[PDB]
Amino acid sequence: AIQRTPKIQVYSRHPPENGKPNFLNCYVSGFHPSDIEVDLLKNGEKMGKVEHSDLSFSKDWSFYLLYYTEFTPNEKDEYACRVNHVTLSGPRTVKWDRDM
């Protein structure tokens, strides 16, 4: 079997404006096999209300998933996405960088 490590992007639906509601996205792509664990982290704690897209895949057969939750950013709060997959040592945490 082939194994492909997930790519991870953490971003907002709209440009982040503090105090304005928005959506926090964690897009996980390029991975194989399909079993994966993804969490969104508000200040290093799991967030509830996290939904995810239906499993699909790209032209090269690698899988992708969108995990997302409505949120309202501000100066304090730190956000991140944490992914575990069999291609990884263990859970990988990617911080949300506002300009990426």
């Binding site: 082939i2 996205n25 194989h32 096999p33 079993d35 897209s53 239906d54 699909s56 300009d99």
Partner: protein, 277 residues
């Protein structure tokens, strides 16, 4: 554009000794998902995943559910056959993925029909463009190919791809026309972030566009810089649009030598952007 597509993507994952394989199907028109089936769901049924699919009646859904349950049973038999072909252990989990669908040309004709499979993430067998022949990756797939030639499988797919596939795609394109027959151009801008007092990151952004296809490239004095560009994978906004960016790290005094070029169906002209200080 002139060409539009429908695709069904199915994933079947064995979980030996742990119940039947998991089976998930999703359908897309162009880059817009419109249906799903999850065999692990409460009541496994094909169900809508676009608001413009909510006007189909229950008999459509029953037929779709029947077809995917039939396919699921075939894919489970396939997974067992393949494990035997490859002399693989009965304890390991394996994946069968299938793609099928049609490209509908601007005049109503079938541009291309598809039916292909991958096993554990590698190409296995594919219906050729002629819809009357197969391409097999190895001897296992040549075995599958013979069983499929014996059962007239190509003819059955050709019938669907040239008929119901296009008819359904046309209906969806009309039912969801405001969503599907739009070309939403990217909103674009360049940002600039120093990395030292002598170098800066220029990042070219494209946001809010549909469909997903886009070209975004940095040039230095008209010369492509892909080897020095960080280009992220096109990603969904979550709202039916897409986002992408590419970035280069450049000497401060060369910043105006760099241009970002954006091509998208929703754009009248290809864009050329420069860091706007």
């Amino acid at each position: 554009a002139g060409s539009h597509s429908m695709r069904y993507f199915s994933t079947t994952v064995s979980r030996p000794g742990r119940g039947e394989p998991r089976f998930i199907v999703v359908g897309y028109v162009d880059d817009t998902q419109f249906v799903r089936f999850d065999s692990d769901a409460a009541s496994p049924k094909m169900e809508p995943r676009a608001p413009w699919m909510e006007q189909e009646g229950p008999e459509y859904w029953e037929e779709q559910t029947r077809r995917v349950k039939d396919a699921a049973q075939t894919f489970r038999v396939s997974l067992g056959n393949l494990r035997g072909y490859y002399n693989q252990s009965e304890a390991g989990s394996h994946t069968l993925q299938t793609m099928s669908g049609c490209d509908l040309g601007p005049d109503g004709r079938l541009l291309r029909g598809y039916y292909q499979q991958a096993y554990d993430g590698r190409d296995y067998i594919a219906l050729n463009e002629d819809l009357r022949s197969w391409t097999a990756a190895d001897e296992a797939a040549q075995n599958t190919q013979r069983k499929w030639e014996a059962a007239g499988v190509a003819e059955q797919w050709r019938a669907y791809l040239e008929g119901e596939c296009l008819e359904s795609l046309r209906r969806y394109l009309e039912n969801g026309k405001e969503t599907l027959q739009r070309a939403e151009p990217p909103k674009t801008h360049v940002t600039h972030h120093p990395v030292s007092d002598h170098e800066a990151t220029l990042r070219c952004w494209a946001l809010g566009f549909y469909p997903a296809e886009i070209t975004l490239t940095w040039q230095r004095d008209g010369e492509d810089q892909t080897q020095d560009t960080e280009l992220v994978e096109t990603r969904p906004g979550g709202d039916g649009t897409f986002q992408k960016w590419g970035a280069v790290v450049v000497p401060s005094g060369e910043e105006q030598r760099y241009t970002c070029h954006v091509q998208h169906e929703g754009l009248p002209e290809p864009l050329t952007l420069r860091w706007e200080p």
